[PDB]
Amino acid sequence: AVGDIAEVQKHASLKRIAMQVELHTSLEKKLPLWFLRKVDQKSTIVYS
C-alpha cells in the first residue's frame, strides 16, 4: 500500500488535470454542436 500510494502521489496533479480533461472531452463528444457553439467562450475576463 505504501508503494502504491507513493506511485499515485508521484503524478497526482497530472492525474487530476487528466481526469478533468477526460471528463470534458467525453462530454463534448456527446453534446450537440449547436449547444457547444452556444456555450463555448473564446476568452475569459477576470476582475529536469
Partner 1 sequence: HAKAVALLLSHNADIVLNKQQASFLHLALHNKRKEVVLTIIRSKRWDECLKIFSHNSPGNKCPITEMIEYLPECMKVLLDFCMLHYIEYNFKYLQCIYEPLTALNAMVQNNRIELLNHPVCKEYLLMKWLAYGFRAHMMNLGSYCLGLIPMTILVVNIKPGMAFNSTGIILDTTNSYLIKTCMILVFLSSIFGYCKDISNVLEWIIYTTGIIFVLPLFVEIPAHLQWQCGAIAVYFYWMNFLLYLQRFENCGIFIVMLEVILKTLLRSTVVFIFLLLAFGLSFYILLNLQDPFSSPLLSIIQTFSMMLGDINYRESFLEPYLRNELAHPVLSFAQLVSFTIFVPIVLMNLLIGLAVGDIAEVQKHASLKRIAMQVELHTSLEKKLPLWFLRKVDQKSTIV
Report the interface residues with partner 1, using CB under 8 A: 1-9, 12, 15-16, 19-20, 23
Beta carbon nearer to partner 1, 7 or 34:
7
Grid coordinates of 31: 453534446
Q: Per CB under 6 A, does 11 bind ligand A1BNO?
A: no
Residue 25 and residue 19 in contact, taking contact as beta carbons nearer than 8 Å: no
Q: Nearest 5 degrees, angle CA 17-CA 47-CA 23? A: 20
Residue nearest to ligand A1BNO (CB): 20
Among 8, 19, 27, 36, binds ligand A1BNO (CB under 6 A): 19
Reported residue count of the chain is 48
